[PDB]
Design an enzyme around this catalytic site. Structure first.
Site, mmCIF file in Angstrom:
data_model
loop_
_atom_site.group_PDB
_atom_site.id
_atom_site.type_symbol
_atom_site.label_atom_id
_atom_site.label_comp_id
_atom_site.label_asym_id
_atom_site.label_seq_id
_atom_site.Cartn_x
_atom_site.Cartn_y
_atom_site.Cartn_z
ATOM 1 N N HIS A 49 33.091 37.049 29.753
ATOM 2 C CA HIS A 49 32.021 37.575 30.690
ATOM 3 C C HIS A 49 32.819 39.141 31.110
ATOM 4 O O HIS A 49 32.050 39.772 31.328
ATOM 5 C CB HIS A 49 31.791 36.575 32.021
ATOM 6 C CG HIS A 49 31.085 37.400 32.959
ATOM 7 N ND1 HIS A 49 31.421 37.927 34.308
ATOM 8 C CD2 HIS A 49 29.786 37.485 32.869
ATOM 9 C CE1 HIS A 49 30.413 38.333 34.972
ATOM 10 N NE2 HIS A 49 29.345 38.132 34.283
ATOM 11 N N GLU A 52 32.381 41.853 28.623
ATOM 12 C CA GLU A 52 30.930 42.287 28.706
ATOM 13 C C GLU A 52 30.839 43.474 30.078
ATOM 14 O O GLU A 52 30.246 44.589 29.469
ATOM 15 C CB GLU A 52 29.962 41.168 29.292
ATOM 16 C CG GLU A 52 28.526 41.761 29.339
ATOM 17 C CD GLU A 52 27.470 40.924 30.247
ATOM 18 O OE1 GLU A 52 27.954 39.710 30.262
ATOM 19 O OE2 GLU A 52 26.617 41.122 30.721
ATOM 20 N N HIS A 53 31.690 43.405 30.883
ATOM 21 C CA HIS A 53 31.772 44.497 31.830
ATOM 22 C C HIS A 53 32.528 45.815 31.330
ATOM 23 O O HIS A 53 31.965 46.961 31.706
ATOM 24 C CB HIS A 53 32.543 44.083 33.274
ATOM 25 C CG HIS A 53 31.698 43.032 34.175
ATOM 26 N ND1 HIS A 53 31.194 43.270 35.237
ATOM 27 C CD2 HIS A 53 31.268 41.740 34.008
ATOM 28 C CE1 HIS A 53 30.650 42.508 36.088
ATOM 29 N NE2 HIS A 53 30.639 41.460 34.996
ATOM 30 N N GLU A 122 37.433 46.344 37.689
ATOM 31 C CA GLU A 122 36.324 45.345 37.356
ATOM 32 C C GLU A 122 36.612 44.047 38.046
ATOM 33 O O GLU A 122 35.958 43.259 38.341
ATOM 34 C CB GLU A 122 36.040 45.036 35.970
ATOM 35 C CG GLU A 122 35.337 46.088 35.278
ATOM 36 C CD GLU A 122 34.067 46.594 36.001
ATOM 37 O OE1 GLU A 122 32.968 45.947 36.247
ATOM 38 O OE2 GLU A 122 34.204 47.622 36.810
ATOM 39 N N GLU A 129 31.222 38.973 42.669
ATOM 40 C CA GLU A 129 30.369 38.127 41.942
ATOM 41 C C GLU A 129 30.227 36.748 42.185
ATOM 42 O O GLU A 129 29.390 36.230 42.247
ATOM 43 C CB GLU A 129 30.278 38.364 40.539
ATOM 44 C CG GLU A 129 29.591 39.450 39.874
ATOM 45 C CD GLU A 129 29.649 39.778 38.330
ATOM 46 O OE1 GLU A 129 30.726 39.846 37.949
ATOM 47 O OE2 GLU A 129 28.440 39.953 37.728
#
Lengths: 438, 85
Positions: A49, A52-53, A122, A129
């Site tokens: 994940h 993906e960022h 990030e 998140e």
């Protein structure tokens, strides 16, 4: 009758699959990868994940800003999502902007910078998140459902990963993950809409030819999960709506019972008080629920993975003193898949599904998602004629036999969120998985 | 002071996650030997005084009373019995 899905391979073992539609003017091209969170261990959980960022944070050529501009200039958009077993990166564009989009996707997958400065930036975004998924109740319920059903197993882990890992993920482990997993024999380049297959194969030969092959190439959609009957209760008296999921261990993509489980799921079906037609649905549970105001909605599901699945129902209700009735009536409708279903319900569900499986594919993104999913789970796109034959093969005897081995008197995984004081303890819920009268 | 399911009369609950596993998934007698020996010993040791002190006191009182009564009704206890009545 839809156009044929064309399929080619490259030398490295990258599959190219396309379905052209000369009636549309847009095209969705992208890369479906047979890899996701499940491929992480406990220490690097969250990596897929995280990547993906970073995929959109700049490559060896285009910087973050240049990347943004290049896509803006294309006119369409790029999108990505990571699941437990699958990662997707696609680009929706105009017909003649397809070579640009393939080039950008090839760049962000093969040649991403993963610069320490961007990792660090990030690392805060992803940390935020963790505290905002909390609002998406359906996702909270399904993540707890996987966590408990597959307790301490890879399928049980979340996609975001623990807070601890987010703070310790390095560019090294990011690079290691995508080098081990994003191999050509695990990847499918898919095009749907206004694409020429032969053009797409050429673009694949131009951009994805220097992809690593894995040492031991297994077929696409190749995987032992040990389901735990269990419950998570997240009581919150301040929430007005209860969210409840109940599931049993379901079927994998390649199970022989795959269609039988879909038919069984369609017999219970979905319901939503906000939709006008829902009070008139044929499903018995729908009728009980709507007549008695037991729920705002329910949604039957049959989620598959490579080697297991979850089959169950997701309920939402404001009726906090009759949650017991809602759960009681739901599980008594499941009992009837074992004891009572006949050709009447089975043929009705088959009728509804024969259309449903075709209706779902109503745009290029849906078509691409269908080609990509089927190629990465089954190794081939299954033609609608084959699907119509497999559905037609489901009898009432098949449904009863399946329910008697999968549902009847079996352990459930149960998640309750919200005002769930009225949800009884595990035993009383699990006792509704059988009928003493039968 | 008690309601019913759905409105039991609890103050609002928030922030507690509860977890458990199926009776079929669990070993019902897990840790039984440890419990039977160590848990019972701990529980018994901590309550022993509350039983021993009153029982031993009232048993002593009884023992003394019954022995005196027995002695008063022998030949030797004739004189002491005469005074006691």
């Amino acid at each position: 009758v839809s156009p044929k899905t064309r399929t080619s391979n490259l030398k490295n073992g990258l599959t190219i699959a396309s379905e052209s539609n000369p009636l549309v003017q847009t095209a969705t091209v992208g890369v479906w990868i047979d890899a996701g969170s499940r491929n992480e261990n406990a220490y690097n959980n969250g990596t897929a994940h995280f990547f993906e960022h970073l995929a959109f944070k700049g490559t060896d050529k285009r910087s973050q800003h240049q990347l943004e501009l290049d896509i803006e200039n294309m006119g369409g958009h790029l999108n990505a999502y990571t699941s437990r077993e699958s990662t997707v990166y696609y680009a929706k564009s105009f017909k003649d902007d397809v070579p640009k989009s393939v080039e950008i996707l090839a760049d962000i997958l093969q040649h991403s910078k993963l610069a320490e400065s961007a990792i660090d930036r990030e690392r805060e975004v992803i940390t935020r998140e963790l505290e905002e998924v909390n609002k998406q109740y359906e996702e909270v319920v399904f993540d707890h459902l996987h966590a408990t059903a597959f307790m301490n197993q890879p399928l049980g882990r979340t996609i975001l990963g623990p807070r601890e890992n987010i703070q310790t993920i390095t560019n090294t482990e990011l690079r290691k993950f995508i080098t081990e997993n994003y191999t050509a024999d695990r990847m499918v380049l898919v095009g749907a809409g206004a694409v020429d297959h032969d053009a797409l194969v050429e673009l694949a030969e131009k951009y994805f030819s220097h992809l690593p092959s894995s040492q031991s190439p297994v077929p696409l959609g190749t995987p032992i999960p040990n389901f735990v009957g269990s419950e998570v209760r997240l009581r919150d008296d301040t929430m007005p709506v209860a969210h409840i999921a109940i599931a049993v261990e379901g079927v994998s993509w390649t199970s022989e019972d795959y269609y039988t489980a879909l038919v069984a799921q369609a017999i219970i079906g979905n319901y939503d008080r906000a939709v006008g037609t829902s009070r008139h649905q044929g499903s018995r549970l729908s009728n009980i629920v709507s007549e008695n105001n037991l729920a705002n909605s329910f949604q039957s599901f049959s989620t598959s993975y490579s080697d297991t699945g979850l089959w169950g129902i997701y309920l939402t209700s404001e009726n906090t003193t009759q949650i017991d009735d809602l759960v009681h009536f739901t599980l008594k409708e499941w009992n009837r898949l074992s004891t009572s279903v006949s050709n009447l319900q089975v043929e009705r569900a088959k009728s509804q599904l024969k259309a449903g499986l075709l209706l779902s594919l109503d745009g290029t993104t849906y078509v691409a998602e269908d080609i990509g999913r089927q190629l990465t789970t089954l190794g081939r796109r299954v033609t609608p004629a084959e699907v119509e034959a497999k559905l037609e093969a489901v009898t009432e005897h098949d449904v009863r036999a399946w329910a008697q081995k999968t549902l009847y008197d079996k352990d459930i995984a149960l998640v309750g969120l919200g005002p769930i004081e009225g949800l009884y303890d595990y035993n009383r819920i699990r006792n509704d998985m059988s009928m003493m009268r039968w | 002071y008690m309601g019913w399911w759905g409105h039991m009369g609890s103050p609002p609950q928030k922030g507690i996650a509860g977890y458990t596993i199926s009776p079929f998934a669990a070993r019902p007698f897990a840790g039984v030997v440890h419990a039977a020996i160590f848990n019972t010993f701990r529980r018994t040791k901590n309550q022993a005084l509350f039983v021993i002190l009153p029982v031993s006191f009232f048993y002593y009182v009884w023992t003394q009373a019954s022995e005196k009564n027995e002695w008063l009704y022998t030949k030797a206890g004739r004189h002491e019995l005469a005074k006691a009545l």
